[PDB]
From Swiss-Prot, chain A:
Native source organism of the sequence: Thermosynechococcus vestitus (strain NIES-2133 / IAM M-273 / BP-1)
Protein location: Cellular thylakoid membrane
Protein name (Swiss-Prot/TrEMBL): Photosystem II CP47 reaction center protein
Gene this chain is encoded by: psbB
The protein's assembly and partners: PSII is composed of 1 copy each of membrane proteins PsbA, PsbB, PsbC, PsbD, PsbE, PsbF, PsbH, PsbI, PsbJ, PsbK, PsbL, PsbM, PsbT, PsbX, PsbY, PsbZ, Psb30/Ycf12, peripheral proteins PsbO, CyanoQ (PsbQ), PsbU, PsbV and a large number of cofactors. It forms dimeric complexes. Part of a photosystem II (PSII) assembly intermediate complex PSII-I; crystallized from a strain deleted of psbJ, it forms monomeric PSII before addition of the oxygen evolving complex. PSII-I includes 3 assembly factors not found in mature PSII (Psb27, Psb28 and Psb34).
Family: Belongs to the PsbB/PsbC family. PsbB subfamily.
Segment of the intact protein contained: 282 to 337 of 510
Function, as annotated: One of the components of the core complex of photosystem II (PSII). It binds chlorophyll and helps catalyze the primary light-induced photochemical processes of PSII. PSII is a light-driven water:plastoquinone oxidoreductase, using light energy to abstract electrons from H(2)O, generating O(2) and a proton gradient subsequently used for ATP formation.
From Swiss-Prot, chain C:
Annotated cofactor note: PSII binds multiple chlorophylls, carotenoids and specific lipids.
Name the UniProt record assigns to this protein: Photosystem II extrinsic protein U
Location(s), subcellular: Cellular thylakoid membrane
Biological source species: Thermosynechococcus vestitus (strain NIES-2133 / IAM M-273 / BP-1)
Taxonomy, superkingdom: Bacteria
Summary of the function given for this chain in its UniProt record: One of the extrinsic, lumenal subunits of photosystem II (PSII). PSII is a light-driven water plastoquinone oxidoreductase, using light energy to abstract electrons from H(2)O, generating a proton gradient subsequently used for ATP formation. The extrinsic proteins stabilize the structure of photosystem II oxygen-evolving complex (OEC), the ion environment of oxygen evolution and protect the OEC against heat-induced inactivation.
UniProtKB/Swiss-Prot annotation, chain D:
The entry's keywords: Membrane, Photosynthesis, Photosystem II, Signal, Thylakoid
Subunit structure as annotated in this protein's UniProt entry: PSII is composed of 1 copy each of membrane proteins PsbA, PsbB, PsbC, PsbD, PsbE, PsbF, PsbH, PsbI, PsbJ, PsbK, PsbL, PsbM, PsbT, PsbX, PsbY, PsbZ, Psb30/Ycf12, peripheral proteins PsbO, CyanoQ (PsbQ), PsbU, PsbV and a large number of cofactors. It forms dimeric complexes.
Gene expressing this chain: psbO
UniProt-listed GO biological process terms: photosystem II assembly; photosystem II stabilization
Protein task: One of the extrinsic, lumenal subunits of photosystem II (PSII), which stabilize and protect the oxygen-evolving complex. PSII is a light-driven water plastoquinone oxidoreductase, using light energy to abstract electrons from H(2)O, generating a proton gradient subsequently used for ATP formation. Required for dimerization of PSII and for binding of PsbQ to PSII.
Gene Ontology MF annotations: oxygen evolving activity
PANTHER family reported in the protein's UniProt record: OXYGEN-EVOLVING ENHANCER PROTEIN 1-2, CHLOROPLASTIC
Annotated protein name in UniProt: Photosystem II extrinsic protein O
Topology in the lipid bilayer: Peripheral membrane protein
Cofactor binding remark: PSII binds multiple chlorophylls, carotenoids and specific lipids.
Length: 56, 56, 97, 243, 56
């Protein structure tokens, strides 16, 4: 929702689609990814999140 | 292959497996009971019988 | 290099129309007058170089040719795909309801 | 002549009819008439698999195997036209029948080799100038060998060609490149070769029998691994009649 | 997996050269090639500045 809000405001201020999306911080985008959702794990899937999907 | 007991079985005439192979590279041989597996099983059963005798 | 040939085939006319060379026989139920009599002759006499070659099946009645002509627009032909025609899958593709 | 209840459970149902030793005759071929094989039966007795060569690139041999799928191996009730050619040769064109069996044999050491033992779409021809079929007649031909599993078959993870997942769903964020060969099912279609050596002929009835040798690829598990080369040996029976 | 075959080394003059084999004592061993009479004809030098027997 926040990503889409920032993109729309960029588009409304005359940015191209490329510019609007390029203005989204990587850090914000990374929160909007299910591999960072704490309810996606397993009891015996041990270790860092990086051990699963990898080091982002 | 780091085989230690296999050569001792082979030295005295145990050369085949129940699964059909022989250490000389033959196929479709029937080793009878005294395959490597039969030898192993005989030793396990002997172990058990000696264990019981020890208790007595 | 590796391709699922059935998924690939969905990107051709096979995915848009009844492919006389590949499509399972139940598909002919979609239009008036094709199933089961024409459906059987079409599958039995495949493959076809063109849709209009379906009109040349030996033994067709005059009425059958008319019905076929009315439905040429719903037909296509693509290369025979082994995966779709083996196993008698054109007669029963393991799909029911 | 035996009934179903005579045969049921004996293993006889998987054997081809035989002809007696007296059947060393000749069956006249009239190039003006049409002919058909009313019943072709193929009964394998031996399955040999070509060993995957160590790396010497020397002679890789066909080795014996153990059948593990029981008396379920024979091809039968096969029919088709028997053409008489310009040169006096005969050509059998297989049209229909029970012309395939899945078969699993086991190599020494445990490796199981599934194959679709088959003569699907067999076209087999004799030598020229076959005025009569005798114990010198033979057929040589090619046949199709389609994928052992057909397009709907789903692997233990639910992946398939015409149905199923197209990825390894249990490894959601795995890199997909190294799993492509497992994820993308492919349908094999290759050729096999067969010789039928006529050993016995009933000139009166038009029944022939003898031995066969066929060569074909085994299962490749929808493109997941390399097939093995298989040699199948056995006996056959065929009944020839004016069409 | 497989024998590569027997390697025969030759110099520019076409004389056969023979690699000196490693004795069991040595964890590492230099690469020295001699003619049939044991005369040094080629080697892999350590110091290059005064090399006379390099393969090059
Ligand atoms: C509050 C406790 C707690 C929590 C929440 C964590 C959390 C974490 N640790 Mg830490 N840690 C702890 C205490 C804890 N730790 C203790 C006490 C030690 C010393 C052993 C450590 C040493 C440690 C190391 C060396 C590592 C971690 C790592 C991690 C991460 C991965 C955890 C994992 O894979 O668990 C797996 C959990 C399980 C598989 C659950 C165990 C369930 C047990 C076996 C059940 C027992 C049942 C019982 C026997 C039944 C009895 C029945 C009877 C009554 C009848 C995670 C951030 C990893 C990491 O990524 O670090 C950077 C890592 O490498 N931890
Ligand atoms: C019951 C009879 C029996 C038989 C037929 C076998 C057979 C076998 N065993 Mg088993 N074994 C047995 C009982 C038996 N075992 C018992 C009771 C034990 C527990 C001690 C073992 C423990 C055992 C081990 C640890 C191993 C075997 C192994 C083997 C294989 C190789 C044998 C070998 O090289 O011997 C070699 C034996 C000798 C060289 C004997 C030496 C005799 C000395 C020198 C005698 C000196 C004293 C004498 C009194 C001197 C005077 C002599 C006089 C004539 C002048 C063979 C399949 C091998 C194997 O392949 O395992 C899978 C192996 O590693 N066995
Ligand atoms: C001849 C021969 C052989 C050999 C053999 C042998 C070597 C044997 C043995 C054996 C044995 C080695 C035996 C044994 C045994 C035993 C026993 C019989 C036991 C027992 C027991 C008991 C009875 C006990 C009891 C008890 C308990 C359990 C607990 C506590 C209490 C009491 C004490 C009560 C062979 C194979 C080469 C081949 C061919 C021939
Ligand atoms: Ca013959």
């Amino acid at each position: 929702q926040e990503i889409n809000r920032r993109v729309q405001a960029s588009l409304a201020s005359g940015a191209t689609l490329e510019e609007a999306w390029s203005a989204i911080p990587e850090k914000l985008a990374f929160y909007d990814y299910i591999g960072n959702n704490p309810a996606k794990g397993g009891l015996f899937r041990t270790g860092p999140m990086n051990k699963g999907d990898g080091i982002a | 292959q780091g085989m230690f007991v296999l050569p001792f079985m082979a030295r005295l005439g145990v050369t085949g497996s129940w699964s059909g192979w022989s250490i000389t590279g033959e196929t479709g041989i029937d080793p009878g009971f005294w395959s490597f597996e039969g030898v192993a099983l005989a030793h396990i059963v002997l172990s058990g019988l000696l264990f019981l005798a020890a208790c007595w | 290099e590796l391709v699922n040939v059935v998924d690939e085939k969905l990107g051709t006319a096979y995915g848009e129309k009844i492919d006389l060379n590949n499509t399972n026989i139940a598909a002919f139920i979609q239009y008036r007058g094709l199933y089961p009599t024409l459906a059987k002759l079409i599958v039995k006499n495949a493959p076809y170089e063109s849709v209009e070659d379906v009109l040349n099946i030996p033994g067709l009645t005059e009425r059958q040719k008319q019905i076929l002509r009315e439905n040429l627009e719903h037909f296509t032909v693509t290369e025979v795909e082994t995966a779709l025609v083996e196993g008698g899958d054109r007669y029963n593709n393991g799909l029911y309801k | 002549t035996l009934t179903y209840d005579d045969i049921v459970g004996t293993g006889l149902a998987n054997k081809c009819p035989t002809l007696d030793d007296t059947a060393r005759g000749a069956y006249p071929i009239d190039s003006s008439q049409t002919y058909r094989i009313a019943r072709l039966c193929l009964q394998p007795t031996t399955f040999l698999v070509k060993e995957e060569p160590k790396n010497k690139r020397q002679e890789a041999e066909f080795v014996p195997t153990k059948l593990v799928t029981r008396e379920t191996t024979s091809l039968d009730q096969i029919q088709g036209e028997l053409k008489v050619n310009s040169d006096g040769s005969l050509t059998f064109v297989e049209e229909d029948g029970i012309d395939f069996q899945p078969v699993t044999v086991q190599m020494a050491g445990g490796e199981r080799i599934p194959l679709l033992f088959t003569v699907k779409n067999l076209v087999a021809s004799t030598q020229p100038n076959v005025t009569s079929i005798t114990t010198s007649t033979d057929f040589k031909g090619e046949f199709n060998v389609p994928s052992y599993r057909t397009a709907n078959f789903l692997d233990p993870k639910g992946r398939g060609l015409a149905s199923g997942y197209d990825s390894a769903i249990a490894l959601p964020q795995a890199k997909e490149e190294e799993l492509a060969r497992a994820n993308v099912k492919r349908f094999s279609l290759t050729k096999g070769q067969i010789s039928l050596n006529v050993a016995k002929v009933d000139g009166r009835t038009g029944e022939i029998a003898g031995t066969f040798e066929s060569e074909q690829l085994s299962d490749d598990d929808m493109g997941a691994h390399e097939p093995h080369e298989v040699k199948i040996q056995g006996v056959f029976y065929a009944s020839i009649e004016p069409a | 997996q497989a024998w590569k075959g027997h390697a025969v080394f030759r110099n520019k003059e076409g004389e056969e050269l023979f690699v000196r084999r490693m004795p069991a004592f040595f964890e590492s061993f230099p690469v020295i090639l001699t003619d049939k009479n044991g005369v040094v004809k080629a080697d892999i030098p350590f110091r290059r500045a005064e090399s006379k027997y390099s393969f090059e």
